[PDB]
Structures are given as C-alpha cells and as structure tokens.
Amino acid sequence: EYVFESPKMKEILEKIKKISCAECPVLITGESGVGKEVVARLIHKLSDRSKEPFVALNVASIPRDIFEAELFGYEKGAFTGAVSSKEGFFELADGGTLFLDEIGELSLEAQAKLLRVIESGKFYRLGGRKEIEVNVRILAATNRNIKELVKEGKFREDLYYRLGVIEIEIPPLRERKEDIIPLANHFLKKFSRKYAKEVEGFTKSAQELLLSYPWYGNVRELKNVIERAVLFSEGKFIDRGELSCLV
Amino acid sequence: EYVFESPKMKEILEKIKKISCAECPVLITGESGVGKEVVARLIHKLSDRSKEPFVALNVASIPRDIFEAELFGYEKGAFTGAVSSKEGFFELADGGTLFLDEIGELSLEAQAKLLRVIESGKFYRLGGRKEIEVNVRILAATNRNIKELVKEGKFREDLYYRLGVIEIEIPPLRERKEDIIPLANHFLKKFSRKYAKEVEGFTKSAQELLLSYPWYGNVRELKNVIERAVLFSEGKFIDRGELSCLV
Amino acid sequence: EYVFESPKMKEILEKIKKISCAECPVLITGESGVGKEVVARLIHKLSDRSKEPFVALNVASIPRDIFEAELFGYEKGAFTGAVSSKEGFFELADGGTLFLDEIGELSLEAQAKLLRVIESGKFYRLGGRKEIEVNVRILAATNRNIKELVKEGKFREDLYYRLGVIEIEIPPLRERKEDIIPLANHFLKKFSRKYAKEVEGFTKSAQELLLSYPWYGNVRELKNVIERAVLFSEGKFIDRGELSCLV
Amino acid sequence: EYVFESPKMKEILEKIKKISCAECPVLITGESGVGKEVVARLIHKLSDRSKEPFVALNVASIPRDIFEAELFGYEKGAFTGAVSSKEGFFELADGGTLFLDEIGELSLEAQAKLLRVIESGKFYRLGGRKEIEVNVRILAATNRNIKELVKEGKFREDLYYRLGVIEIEIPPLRERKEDIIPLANHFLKKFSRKYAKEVEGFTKSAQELLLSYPWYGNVRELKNVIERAVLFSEGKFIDRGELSCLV
Amino acid sequence: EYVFESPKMKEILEKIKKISCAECPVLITGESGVGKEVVARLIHKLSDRSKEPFVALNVASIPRDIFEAELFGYEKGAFTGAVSSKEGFFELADGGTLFLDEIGELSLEAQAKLLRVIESGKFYRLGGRKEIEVNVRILAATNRNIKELVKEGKFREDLYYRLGVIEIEIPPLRERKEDIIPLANHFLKKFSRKYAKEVEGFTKSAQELLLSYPWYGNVRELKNVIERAVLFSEGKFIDRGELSCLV
Amino acid sequence: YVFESPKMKEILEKIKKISCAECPVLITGESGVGKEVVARLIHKLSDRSKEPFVALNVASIPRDIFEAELFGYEKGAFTGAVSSKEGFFELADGGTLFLDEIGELSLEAQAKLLRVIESGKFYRLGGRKEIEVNVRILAATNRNIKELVKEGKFREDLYYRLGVIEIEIPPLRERKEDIIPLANHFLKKFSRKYAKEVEGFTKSAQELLLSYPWYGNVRELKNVIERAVLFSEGKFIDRGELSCLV
Amino acid sequence: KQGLQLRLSQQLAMTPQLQQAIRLLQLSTLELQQELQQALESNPLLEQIDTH
Ligand SMILES: Nc1ncnc2c1ncn2[C@@H]1O[C@H](COP(=O)(O)OP(=O)(O)OP(=O)(O)O)[C@@H](O)[C@H]1O
Numbered sequence A, B, C, D, E: 001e002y003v004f005e006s007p008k009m010k011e012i013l014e015k016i017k018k019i020s021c022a023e024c025p026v027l028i029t030g031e032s033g034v035g036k037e038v039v040a041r042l043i044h045k046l047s048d049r050s051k052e053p054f055v056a057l058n059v060a061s062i063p064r065d066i067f068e069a070e071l072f073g074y075e076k077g078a079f080t081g082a083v084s085s086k087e088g089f090f091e092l093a094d095g096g097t098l099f100l101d102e103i104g105e106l107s108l109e110a111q112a113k114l115l116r117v118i119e120s121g122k123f124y125r126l127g128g129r130k131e132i133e134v135n136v137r138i139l140a141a142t143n144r145n146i147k148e149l150v151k152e153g154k155f156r157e158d159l160y161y162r163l164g165v166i167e168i169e170i171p172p173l174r175e176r177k178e179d180i181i182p183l184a185n186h187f188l189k190k191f192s193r194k195y196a197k198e199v200e201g202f203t204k205s206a207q208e209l210l211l212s213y214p215w216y217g218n219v220r221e222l223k224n225v226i227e228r229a230v231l232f233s234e235g236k237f238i239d240r241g242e243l244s245c246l247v
Numbered sequence F: 001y002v003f004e005s006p007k008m009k010e011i012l013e014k015i016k017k018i019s020c021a022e023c024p025v026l027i028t029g030e031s032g033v034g035k036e037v038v039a040r041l042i043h044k045l046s047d048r049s050k051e052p053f054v055a056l057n058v059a060s061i062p063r064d065i066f067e068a069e070l071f072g073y074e075k076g077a078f079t080g081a082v083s084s085k086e087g088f089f090e091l092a093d094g095g096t097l098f099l100d101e102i103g104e105l106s107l108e109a110q111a112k113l114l115r116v117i118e119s120g121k122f123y124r125l126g127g128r129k130e131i132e133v134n135v136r137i138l139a140a141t142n143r144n145i146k147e148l149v150k151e152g153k154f155r156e157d158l159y160y161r162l163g164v165i166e167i168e169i170p171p172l173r174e175r176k177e178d179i180i181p182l183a184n185h186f187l188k189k190f191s192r193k194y195a196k197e198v199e200g201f202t203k204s205a206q207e208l209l210l211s212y213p214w215y216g217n218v219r220e221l222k223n224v225i226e227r228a229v230l231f232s233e234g235k236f237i238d239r240g241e242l243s244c245l246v
Numbered sequence G: 001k002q003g004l005q006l007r008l009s010q011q012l013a014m015t016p017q018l019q020q021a022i023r024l025l026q027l028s029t030l031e032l033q034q035e036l037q038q039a040l041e042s043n044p045l046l047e048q049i050d051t052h
C-alpha cells in the first residue's frame, strides 16, 4: 500500500522481511517524515505475532510520579488509591509487540527502570510478591542520533546495547529522489477522492519543482503541500503557480 | 457584525470560505491585537462543526506536573486523591473544535506529548487500559513567527509541520489603511449607545490623524482610543484635539 | 480625610468623576507614597461598585507553582491534595473590584497566564469541566514605567493594552507644592490628636523648610517626618530645629 | 538587668522611654555584636505590650519557597502534602511584637511580600479567600547601611519608608571605652558562677589590655574572651597571661 | 553453560568458589555486559543455600513512597486502604540470597535504611510491633565508579565499607582477547539451532577482525553482533565482509 | 579499643583529662586514625556517658535540604513532608553531636550553623513553638583548618567556638609499634568471627606490615586483615597472601 | 527539596478517622440541650417533642 520505489527503501524492506523469524528488539533511527511508524507496523505485520496485540507508547506523556505504576501495575492496597488491581502496559503486550515512540525523550531516571525488563522480562508489581514472566517483542523509534546521545551523557550506555540489537536507518526523502513522484501521485488519489475534486495529474513543471524543492519535512511536508494545492486548485490539473507560492 | 473592507483581508476571507469542507488543523499567525481569535471563530462558524462546542484553551497556564492529566483524563485509582473518573479536553471536545491560544508559550517538554494525538487522534487515560480515538478539528493561534523559532530552536519542527497544514497570516493594522476608518466608525457606533453619548461622527482632521498613527496596539488600541474619546466627549463631533493622544 | 489642593489633583478628581460609570479596567502609575491606593479606592467608591467588595491582592505574594490554583481555584481530584472544590480570587470578587497591587514586579510567565481572563472573563478551574464567567472591574497599580518595560522586553506587550484602556499618572509631591502645607497641617493635627500632644501648628520657618526640601518618599515621607517631629515635640509650636532630618 | 554607662547608651535608653508610647515600627542599624537584640527586648518591655508575647525571628534562614507558607500559613488544599491549616508568623505575633534580625541580608525579591502587610495589616492565607487583620509592631535590626543598599539598587524604597519611621543607631564597642570595664566585670561574675571558678576580678595589666584593644566583635567577642579566660584560669584574679587569645 | 578460558577469569572463578560459602555482603563493580548477574547466580548456585530462593531486585524499580512498604513490608490498618498485611522482599530471601541490581541508584534515605537493616540484623514492619529477624546473604552489583560517588557524596562511606569488604572486578573484554573466540562460537552454534540458520563458524579473517574491534559492551555487544550475523547469513562460513558492515 | 604507643597513651591521658570539660572539642588528623573512637571515648568518660552519641558526617548532607536537617519540619510543611522529622540537635538533646569532616562544609551553611549553637534555640520548619535544647559539640577535621581559614574557605568565629580544646591524632605511618598488636587483634577477631582456625602471622610476613606505608591507616589495615583471613587456608598466614593485596 | 508544588502523587495516608460525635460525651445535660437548640435552629427537618 505504501511506496518503496527507492533501492535503499527496497533494501530496508528486504531487511524487514529477513527478520520475520527474529524476536530481538529493533531500533529505528531517522528524521521526521521518514516512516518510522510505517516501518514498525510493517515489521509487526510481517512478524509471526501480527495477530497479537500491538501497543504503542509515547514515553513523554506518562506522569513522572506514576511511571512505575503504569508500566508494571499494582495490587490492591499497594498505595492509598489502589482500590482495584490493574495490569500494566507490558502485560497488555504480553505475547504481542510493544513500540516505544520518541524514546529519546526519556529522563535518565526512567531509563534505568527498563534494564531488566528488556533483557529478562521479569518484574515485580507494586505490592506484588510473586515474579511475573512475560514474552514481549520490543520496537523503538527515535528522531535523533542515539550514538551521539550515548557519547554525550544524555542516554544510558546499557540501554543502547539492550535496545540496539538490530538498527535500521531510514534515509531522508531528499536522497530518495525516486520516491517523491510515486508518493505525490498517491497522495493525490488520497485527497481528491476525499474532497470530490477534478484533479487527475501533475504538470511537468510542478514535478520538476517538487524534485528540486528540498523536503525537510519529507513525506509529511509533501502531503501537506499536495493537500493545500488540491484545496486551492481550479481546473483538471495542477499548474506551476498552484504550488510555487508554497514550495 | 464584523467589518472586512481591506482588499488583503478579502483574500483571507476567500481562503476561509474555500476551506469550509476541510477538517485539517489550522495555524494562525499575526501581531497582537489584530483579531486572530476572531478569525478562528469565523472559521469555526463556517465549518460543518458550527453546531459543536468551540473549546478555546490557553496552553500558557496549564500546570506542567498535571499537563498530560489535564489533556488526557484519568481513571479511578490512578493516583492518590483520584476517587472519581474525569476526562480531558480532547475527549470533552470530541467532534468539535479545539483552539489553542499562544501556542508558542509552550515549553519544549510539553510540546513532545501531543505528537501522537494531533495526527492519529489516539491516546491513553491515566490508569486506563483501553485505546480511545477522537475526531476533532485542531486550530492554533500565535503571534511570534513559528518558523524563526524552529530555526533558532525554541519550538518543535515536527509539531510545527503537523500543526501547520493550513497557515493564515494576519497583516498589521498599519498595512491595512482601508479598515482604520470603518473600524473607528464601528467602535464609535458601538460605544455611543452604551454610555448614551451624543457623538455621531468624526472630524476631517481627526480622520487624517487616524491615517498617520502607526497603531502599535492595532485594533485593541484603536478600540481603547475610541472608548476614551467617547467617555471624554462633549461635542457631537470628535475634533483633532481630543485625538491628540495619537500625536 | 484626603486633601486635593494641587490643580493636577483636581483634574484627576474630575476625570475620576467622569469615569464613575466607566467599567473598563484602569492602570495607575506613579512613585512611592504618591497615593495610588487612595486614588484607586476613590475611583472604586465613586463607581457603581461603592457597596461591592473590593478585593486588593498583591501578585508577588503567591508562590509560582500554585499561582494558577490561587488565581482560578481548583476542582476535586485535580491533584494530590485537591480534597474539595475551591474557588479562586477572581471568583471571590464577583461583581466587585479587583485591585492588582504592584503589577510591575509580576514575572513574564505569569503575565501570559491571564491574557484571556481580563478581556473575556472566561476561565476553567483546575479539574473543572464547566466554563466560569465572572464580571470584575480591574484596577492595577504600579510604581514602574510599564510603557518603557514593554519596549525593554521586561513586560509583555499583550497585557499592556489589556490593562491600558485607561491610564492615570500621579505626579510626585515635590511638584505638588499646593499640597505640602495642607497635608502637613492635617498630619500634624491627626498626630497631635492621637498622641495627646498640645501642638497646634508649625512656625513660619518650619513652613518654609517644608516647602523647600526635595522629598523622595513624597506623602509617605512627609507623614513619617511629621510623626517623628510630633513624637519628639516639646512645645505648642514646631520649629525648624525639630525638623533637622531634612537639611 | 542591663548595664548602661556611656552617655550614648543613656541617650538611647531615654529615647526608648520617650518613644515607648509610640506604636511605630523601628529600624535599628549598627554592627555585629553591638546589642541590637538586647535593645529590642528592652523596647518591648518598656512598651505597653510587655505582657504580650514577643516573637523574634532570624530571617536569614527561612527558605524562599516556604517564605509565604511560613509568613501567611496555608489552608488544607494550598499545596501537596498539607492536611491541616497552619498559622502565620504575623498571626502568631498578633497582639504583640515581631522582631526581624538582619533585615539587610533579606533577598530583594522577597521584600515585596512585606510591602502591604506592614501598612494595611490585612492579608490572605495560601489557599484561602478570607482577609485577616492583626495588630503587630515591627522591629527590625540590621548591621548594614539600608540607605546605601537602596541607592545601589538592592533594597525596596517603599519597604524602607514603611519601616524607616523610627531610627535607632547603636555605635560599636570601639566607641564605648567607658562601657568596657562594667561589661567585663559583669561577664566575669556571671561565668565565675557558671563554671564554679570563683574568680573575683582582674589585675591592672589585664584591664589595661582589655581597655586598649579596639574590639571588632564587640560585646560578643569580649564575652567569648572572658568565658575562655574563666575556662582556662585557676586564680582569684585574671592577669594578662591568661588573656593570650588577644592580639 | 558458561565459558571461562582467561587466567584472570579463572582466578576470579576460584575466588568465587572460595567466597561462595561465606556470610558477608558482596559488591560487584565492572563495565557494561561483563556478567554481574551471571557472577551473582554462579555464587548462588555454588553455595550450600543453592536451593534457597534467589531474590533479584532493582533499586530503581521501587518507588520511594512505598520503599519502606516494599523492601520491608507493612501491616493491616497502618494506613488507609490496607485491607491485608503484606510481607516484604527482605523476609522473602530469609536464609537465601538477595541480589541488588545497580546499587548506585539508591537515595540517601534508602541507603541509610539499608545500612540500618544490615547493621542491626533485625528490622520492623511499616506499622507492625514485633521485630523480624532474617539470615540473608546480600549481593549487590553496580557499574558506576563507587569511588567517585563517595567522593561526591552520593553513597555513604560506611555502607560502602560494609558492603565492599570484597571487591570483584571483571576485566574488560578488551583485556580478555584469548577468551573472545570461545564465547562467540558458543553463540554462533546456539543461534544456529535457534534460528535454523546453517553455519559452521568464522573464517581466519573474521576471527582476526573480532580480535581487533574495541568492544565496549563486552559480552553483550559481541552477542548482539553474533546474533545479527546469524540472522543475516545463509552460508556455513562467516566472512570478513559480513561482519565489516556491522563494525 | 587498643592503645599501646606512647603517643596513644598521651592521647588517652589528655582525653581523660578533658573528660570533665564540657566545652566543644575539635579533633584533626589524617583519614582512618580514630577521631570517632576518640570522640566516643570522650563521650563515655564524661558525665554524659548514658546520653546518646549522635555522630554524623556533613559530606552526604544535600545542599538544598540542609536546613531541613538542621532544624526539622512538621506534617504538611512542604512536598515530601508526610510526617514530622527531628533535626540532629533535637535528637541529641542532652547528648553529644559529632560532626565529622567539618572542614568541607560550604561557607554559607556554616554561617547558619554556629548561630544555632550560640543562642541554643531554634524553630522547626512548620512549627509555631520555639525549641530550646542543650548539646555538646564534637568536630572532626581532615585538613589544616588554620590553612583553610587563611584561604577564605571557613569562618574564624566558628574556629574559635570549636577551638576551645583541639586534639591532633598522629596517623599510623608514625605508629609502627602498634602495627603488630593491631594486626594480631584484627586477626583473632576475624578468625573467631568467621570460625576458622588461624594462629598468627609468620616471621616472614611481619616485615611487610612495617614496609607498607599504610596510607589508609587502620581502615585499610582492617580491610587487608579481613581479606587475608577470608582467603586463608591454614592456621598460619604467609607473605604470599599479603603480597597479592599489597 | 523545599517547595510548594502541585503534582500527582502516590503516597500512604494514616488513619485519622476520628473526632465525630465524640464531643457529645464530655458535655453536661445543659450544654447538650444548648447544642440541640442550635441544631434545631439550623436544621428545618429537626423538631423536638413538646407539650403545648
Ligand atoms: N512509504 C510511504 N508511503 C506512504 N505514506 C508514507 C510512507 N512513509 C510514510 N508515510 C506517511 O507519513 C506520515 C507521517 O508519519 P510517519 O510514519 O512518517 O512518522 P514520523 O514523522 O517518522 O514520526 P512518528 O513516529 O512520530 O509518527 C504517515 O501518516 C504515513 O502515511
């Protein structure tokens, strides 16, 4: 359904296919608009646990003082307020896949809390006196260079090796000059049919402008520009001036 | 009710009328006191969500330690003192419009929390174990140029790309010489009835003076000046002397 | 109880009389001991809110991390400690006047947290899902040149025009030579009546001395000097010798 | 009681007697060890609130975050961790006298918290909506020149004119050559009974050395030297050899 | 099965055999991925109390507010919500081995409590009355330089002396070159059965490459590289080119 | 505790002489010499023998909560103050407070410390009542306190207040006569603690103890003796086991 | 760290559950009647048996 016309994207797809029989946690590194969520969901679908639940978590939205409670759960009576026992996110992803997005936004105090769950997967609930054994497949996505953060002191050295078993780097859309055109057409079919418009193609000058225009926002910026062009179009095609003011 | 006489604002009005069927996020930039919230409300009225709540939220005053809790909701037993269930703004405004005022005041730590709720509309409540999706229209208003802040590094680039699907820029009142007289007349007619003032028009010298003041406060300053003139008015016509505060 | 013998004071009083029916917020600027509180309370008394409660609050007296709680109140379950629903100071002065004392010392962050409340009167409590509408006339007092602080970047320009509908300037007492003799006589009479002193006026040399010193605390310094003289007085008439602390 | 021999001490005592009938706040300036607290206690006894409690506080140790919490108290829901209401220092000193040691060292930011309480006497607790009126006499002692701090942009002039109504100056021991022998004899007699050394007086050389020395620590340093001499002597009279701690 | 083909490793193993029968706390300091958990479990296995439970816990996995409620336990009625009393982890390892992972993350109060428990030998419940006695063998493993922590003040010196009676330092894998080859061949076969990938071993060039790479993760990085090679290889011999890209 | 050297005998006699002295006592020297031992001896030999000996090190005290440990707080005073806490002065009411390594304290904290000592009265952070206590102050210093004062990193008034009686303990580097008794005492104590038959060190190994400069002094000596006991397999300890540690 | 902060916390709370209907034991009959009179005044649904 997506577009993987670039040979580098074909290599990444082949690497995704080659880890169908694997279960070690996977790390994804790249810029914005590259398809980290797309790669994670493709790996999940090609994995044998595709039918299993897939839980995606952003580590920046969990409150600081309840970090242990959410990811580990608690029994009734553990603290004032624990009137009913709850199951954590990890046990929700027991037998499935857990995808951590924006994992570089994790405070150093919260990073050391995940050393043993990644390796062994065994943890004790808040107020739980019996060990819990689970099977979790871990995927992580980051928008910054993890090696630089490790060498700089903003990221734990142990956590990078725990998570960095298989590293995938998504190239920017700028290097993927052969993917802009196949995407730009597809987004058109995503927009006009949703808006009941009469645009069925792009002019050669518009295509050349899109090729020359640098996509810092990559696929997201391309989609935004194409959607704006479709919104403010008038005719059966998109001329140069319809998108020149934007890109 | 409102007045739109300047030819440049006519293009903005036409763009608003051309996105009546759209539901994508909208970002608005402009100087202080130009009417960004008025433009947002005008866009809301013309939208298909006109019969839906228009939840306007100030993100510059939300406490940080409960910021997520104030935008995601919480379950019973999530923390001590939470003896009841409650929601956030996203669930309370489902199917409506959420308008964030002064989006630039947000700190970097808070800007990394909505990255997975603006696009897909999904999140998790504090202590909840069931995924929830909402369909809301996201609008934002700001005064500082977001692009230059991203270049400097005081705002998230990916969040800017996500929010900046359609950007509307309001020019300063000094560039708009075709609305100063109509807005002054509208303010005079509005304030001549609240205090039963006998003022019925302005003087030619006063009108000439109105075309020279830079209008630092723009529409708000013009409204305040008209109110001061009405309150301190003796004759039926406002002479240039009563507008000496603009000299 | 209040002496207004200087022509500028009479002009200020007449302007106050003209704005008795005016409900817009007012900002007062002056020096230390000029009478900002007295003028503000006179404005409050002459307005329609004569019998309404007059809530005078200092912004700097509130901690930073509970500023929003003290400003808007909170609902049950908002935080660890939100035992019951509590109203804010704005809801405390419903229908009356709110007096922001020493508004100049307010930090930039706090000035961005009250931009929607002043102009519209609508704000949501911490944990409350219902909108609160309040009607309070705002009088702010400052000893700083806010019109220069907005240029210097130490004050937010957005709030300046929200508090700049009406601006009052109180000239220093050293320019109010028509007030020095009457204020000195009134203070001497009051301090003789309270302290059971048998003094009933000044001497001509003392009067000449009181009209030549460059007072810096203005009326408050004059009151302090008069009280000091009355305490150490030893005769029915006060001479220049008692007022040796001037020059 | 307290021994005063020098003419300056007699004049200070007479001025205290004269102004005891006054309820004005007092500001005392001197050095470290000049006996400002003793003078303040004498003032409290000689006033009409001698039977009323006297609360003396060293404001150089109060944390900044709990400054308002200690001064104004708080209610049940003021912040996190509080369960019960707490009184303020002003309320604890209501109907009495409040003394502030080393007011010069106070931070410039926190000086705004005492601008209105001293004059108006009305304030609100943290988390409360009720105004509280007291009757407390403010005494402040400092070893630094307040006026110099005001001139160099370190002190709030409004607070100065609030407290600078009654001024007291205590010269150091270097100008108290007459008042060295009585203090030395009093301290020797006290410590002889304290440590059971039974020492009666001093010899000629010891008295000459004590009188000739320009004490910098003043009465405190003299008392410490006397205590050390008592601890390290076995004769009936202390000679210069036992006073080797001096220069 | 574990491989130890290094003379330093053999000496460390003999030390493990000698001390495994002792009754003193053990402190394990080493680099990342050296086998601290492996060493601790080897100590537990080669002991008279090998049948006893091995309670391995992480000091960063315990919330502070329930630390005394987790490592020690609590009784019924000592706090709200306490339906039933629950034992602590300390009583769980009675007569066995308690392992503390990353001991350097403990707070000052937590370290003080741990020192109290270790010195006294008997502790108390959270809200109990009787005193509980245990016979635990305490092991703790950390990678931080404890000398820097004690010099800065993040670890109690007396606690370090008590726990650090014996210091076990696993040499870095860069100093264990002679042991590098047997380890990888242990993984290469193990993954070959695990992932059904047919492989016989490495070549001369690959072995020379492995002995030249400056490993930082020690065992963990080597294991990750071997697993990557097994996944991304179909041939029976791993060549230099296959491992060169990973390096 | 064992003291056999003439310097140690003089130290013990001086401590017994200052037993009747109630003034605060300062002790200085090198690391691992027995400043805490000497302070406890002073505590036992004085009239305050039954009173607690509240000994703490000022190195681990956090900067921002120093006052929280100086006076104490009540319930609800601040975030994290679930209950009330008593400062070391309140805990040592009538006892002896021993501040170890006082020379490393920050300057601003020191100015807030002796002020409590001289007046003797203090307020809890969150308490409305003034607290009056009586304490005896013992201080320990690891560096040259006079040199620190001359460098502007200390207070002269605090030095004078705690300098009423000052003691210097020579380190183990100049106490070779105690080396054999201390080694024998530690050897016997560890042998009886770990229940292993060890008689004593041989003639060959006795040279290494005197050859060792003993930078760590008695702490390092005890650690080395315990480690040698743990790895010992016979009733006699040779020079080989000590060689691996030295 | 000293500071008045608004946050979400997971803490243990003691059991101060007391001080209700306990002050009615220490009072005499006359003061109890006075308290009952106050309660009757403040509550419209409370009435006391009479004889008129
Ligand atoms: N090959 C592709 N074909 C079609 N759409 C794509 C492709 N790659 C990415 N997209 C689109 O890019 C959009 C932006 O999400 P994307 O997966 O790129 O996230 P991102 O910017 O890398 O980061 P985040 O993990 O925070 O979502 C998605 O809605 C997806 O539809």
Ligand SMILES: Nc1ncnc2c1ncn2[C@@H]1O[C@H](COP(=O)(O)OP(=O)(O)OP(=O)(O)O)[C@@H](O)[C@H]1O
Pocket: B001, B002, B003, B004, B031, B032, B033, B034, B035, B036, B037, B038, B101, B102, B141, B183, B186, B219, B220, C115, C116, C158
């Ligand atoms: N075309 C118009 N006709 C009449 N009034 C207008 C018009 N445009 C703007 N205004 C007036 O301008 C006033 C100031 O606008 P607004 O409140 O949006 O300013 P702001 O300070 O930039 O807002 P914000 O609260 O988002 O910071 C509004 O109260 C509105 O009544």
Ligand SMILES: Nc1ncnc2c1ncn2[C@@H]1O[C@H](COP(=O)(O)OP(=O)(O)OP(=O)(O)O)[C@@H](O)[C@H]1O
Pocket: C001, C002, C003, C004, C030, C031, C032, C033, C034, C035, C036, C037, C038, C039, C101, C102, C141, C142, C183, C219, C220, C223, D158
């Ligand atoms: N016309 C007057 N007649 C009598 N007293 C006056 C007059 N004007 C000012 N005062 C005196 O001035 C003193 C200070 O007044 P006020 O409280 O307004 O001062 P301020 O420094 O301007 O106030 P704030 O800083 O609190 O806004 C009062 O004690 C008041 O009695």
Ligand SMILES: Nc1ncnc2c1ncn2[C@@H]1O[C@H](COP(=O)(O)OP(=O)(O)OP(=O)(O)O)[C@@H](O)[C@H]1O
Pocket: A115, A119, A158, E001, E002, E003, E004, E031, E032, E033, E034, E035, E036, E037, E038, E039, E141, E143, E186, E219, E220
């Ligand atoms: N002798 C060995 N033979 C085989 N594998 C070994 C050996 N020693 C260690 N390992 C491997 O080392 C891996 C990591 O070791 P371990 O669990 O002790 O980590 P660690 O050093 O405590 O980690 P961290 O310091 O990062 O928390 C284990 O999964 C284990 O397979």
Ligand SMILES: Nc1ncnc2c1ncn2[C@@H]1O[C@H](COP(=O)(O)OP(=O)(O)OP(=O)(O)O)[C@@H](O)[C@H]1O
Pocket: F001, F002, F003, F030, F031, F032, F033, F034, F035, F036, F037, F038, F100, F101, F140, F182, F218, F219, F222
């Ligand atoms: N004469 C001795 N006999 C036996 N053990 C001794 C002797 N002197 C010192 N020790 C040992 O030295 C160790 C450290 O003692 P102590 O803490 O009193 O010294 P310190 O480190 O110099 O003091 P401080 O840190 O308090 O300034 C203790 O374990 C004690 O048993």
Ligand SMILES: Nc1ncnc2c1ncn2[C@@H]1O[C@H](COP(=O)(O)OP(=O)(O)O)[C@@H](O)[C@H]1O
Pocket: D001, D002, D003, D004, D031, D032, D033, D034, D035, D036, D037, D038, D141, D219, D220
């Ligand atoms: N008239 C006096 N008689 C006896 N002692 C005095 C007298 N005046 C001052 N002192 C002594 O001087 C000391 C000064 O203490 P205090 O006033 O607290 O500090 P400062 O003088 O720095 O303000 C007191 O301890 C007191 O004993």
Ligand SMILES: [Mg+2]
Pocket: E036, E037, E101, E102, E141
């Ligand atoms: Mg480990």
